[PDB]
Ligand binder design. Structure first.
Ligand code: NAG
Ligand code: NAG
Lengths: 38, 48
């Protein structure tokens, strides 16, 4: 049978956060991928 | 005005899906880290 092979490890991870003196809360930017890990 | 923004991951591109290969890559220092920041600065300048 014929099986297509798509490599793993979709996209990169980018951290979006304000300054240290502002707040410690962060917002993670997943690039070119659907919500998965969360 | 703007050039196509391309962020190349040197961890995946150089060593595909391999930790042992990446272990040898860490012996090269910042070659991965520095080049990834060089292309990062390009994508930032294209936005500027
Ligand atoms: C944060 O900013 C405030 C107001 O400018 C300043 O008074 C304070 O020293 C800063 N704290 C830190 C940790 O940088
Ligand atoms: C992520 O979800 C959107 C929903 O429209 C979809 O179009 C997109 O293809 C998904 N991610 C990828 C890279 O396929």
């Amino acid at each position: 049978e014929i099986l297509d092979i798509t490599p793993c490890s979709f996209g990169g991870v980018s951290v979006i956060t304000p300054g240290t003196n502002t707040s410690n809360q962060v917002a993670v930017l997943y690039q070119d991928v659907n919500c998965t890990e969360v | 005005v703007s050039m196509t923004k391309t962020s190349v991951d040197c961890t995946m591109y150089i060593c595909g899906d391999s930790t042992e290969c990446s272990n040898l890559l860490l012996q090269y220092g910042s070659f991965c880290t520095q080049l990834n920041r060089a292309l990062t600065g390009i994508a930032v300048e294209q936005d500027k």
